[PDB]
Ligand SMILES: Nc1ncnc2c1ncn2[C@@H]1O[C@H](COP(=O)(O)OP(=O)(O)NP(=O)(O)O)[C@@H](O)[C@H]1O
Ligand SMILES: Nc1ncnc2c1ncn2[C@@H]1O[C@H](COP(=O)(O)OP(=O)(O)NP(=O)(O)O)[C@@H](O)[C@H]1O
């Protein structure tokens with residue numbers, strides 16, 4: 001009946017933000033039509049699907065998220081059927097210029113463009129830069145929910161507070177959910193789990209697994225962890 | 238004067254911080270060196286965090302962001318982390334810098350370094366993988382740029398995009414190139430053949446398991462194994478070219 005738009009965000013890189021975006025989107029696509037938007041200048045998601053993009057002959061140096069934001073192409077012509085029930089808007093390195101571009105109403109470009117999107121998805125999942133920048137603002141201003149992958153490091157609580165402060169400044173009342181990634185059984189992960197596990201939007205934990213880098217998934221032990229996380233998330237919204 | 242080197246790249250995970258640490262450490266053998274951690278990831282800061290904690294530094298008040306906000310003086314943020322090596326630490330509040338509205342925002346680090354009493358032979362600045370106002374602050378007071386590159390797709394295009402960004406700054410900074418995480422395969426040969434002809438190419442760093450382990454979490458001292466020799470060759474070629 002309406003698209004549910006989930007931003008995956010984290011101010012620290014290497015916390016499984018992009019990995020969680022791919023796997024949650026893929027799990028959702030089992031019974032839903034899902035759109036991935038790769039708004040990360042690293043373009044991790046895009047290059048995970050690059051072999052598929054190549055076999056289809058997509059010209060993503062012309063049709064990508066940055067050119068949507070610059071209003072040079074329409075969003076309809078950028079969408080790539082990369083997997084079962086899964087579409088992608090690819091990222092491209094020119095996106096690096098977005099932060100310095102001078103544009104009117106720059107914060108609302110993604111929201112405006114999504115208002116001109118003919119195709120209809122059950123879920124839209126947005127990967128973001130590990131930064132509190134105008135790109136994150138574009139994702140947040142059209143989102144319904146946020147999922148933040150966290151690791152049990154020093155400044156983990158402080159980093160979550162800084163993100164909360166950034167969303168407040170946007171005058172937004174977004175449910176913000178928490179995942180603990182790279183989970184190991186030791187004191188450092190117990191302290192963060194003990195803090196996080198009390199919060200109503202804590203979804204669960206992902207264990208550090210070597211087997212989980214552009215190969216298909218086989219529903220192993222780490223996929224089950226994401227499956228439990230997704231089930232809890234769906235019960236809370 | 239101090240010679241001021243920015244380490245930059247627009248792809249993350251290319252050994253940017255690792256190269257900043259190891260080059261600053263090598264230089265510190267015969268020089269007084271200042272490391273400035275201007276990366277919101279704070280990789281350099283948390284590589285030295287055990288030393289910082291033993292000294293009891295309150296770097297949530299004295300850090301690179303509070304310098305840029307003109308809330309603390311640069312002299313009081315400096316931490317002696319190793320032999321002949323000083324550090325200005327990064328702290329997570331630096332994330333707000335990109336959204337702060339400030340006059341002459343591009344020149345805050347340059348102005349700040351003009352008020353620095355201490356005198357260094359070399360200053361080495363670690364940066365975010367981003368074409369943002371933070372990167373501009375580093376470039377506008379640097380003498381040289383070192384870019385670590387990997388054999389990824391679009392690496393040439395990414396270098397062309399970086400050079401265009403430096404050019405728009407009305408800057409004529411010598412830009413040097415390192416190929417990092419080098420493995421023996423076709424993809425790395427293609428980039429090597431492209432880069433090795435360029436005039437400020439410095440050489441290559443091989444991907445090594447023991448170098449991952451020493452900085453990954455062990456926060457370990459270096460032992461001058463084969464990858465340290467690779468960095469030593471890169472530094473010597475660099476020093477002969479400036
Ligand atoms: N639970 C995990 N188990 C094993 N490896 C992991 C796990 N989470 C992340 N990684 C690895 O961590 C690295 C970083 O990927 P990832 O963290 O997903 O990027 P990111 O944090 O989202 N930053 P970005 O790529 O800009 O979106 C990759 O090598 C992943 O394979
Ligand atoms: N040559 C190498 N051999 C082995 N591991 C490496 C090598 N270069 C980098 N790494 C590892 O790659 C990871 C990230 O390296 P890093 O120096 O942070 O790149 P960077 O992302 O460009 N700099 P930064 O963003 O500030 O952390 C670390 O775990 C390093 O140990």
Ligand SMILES: [Li+]
Pocket residue numbers: 081082083084085
């Ligand atoms: Li398909």
Ligand SMILES: [Li+]
Pocket residue numbers: 081085086
């Ligand atoms: Li489809």
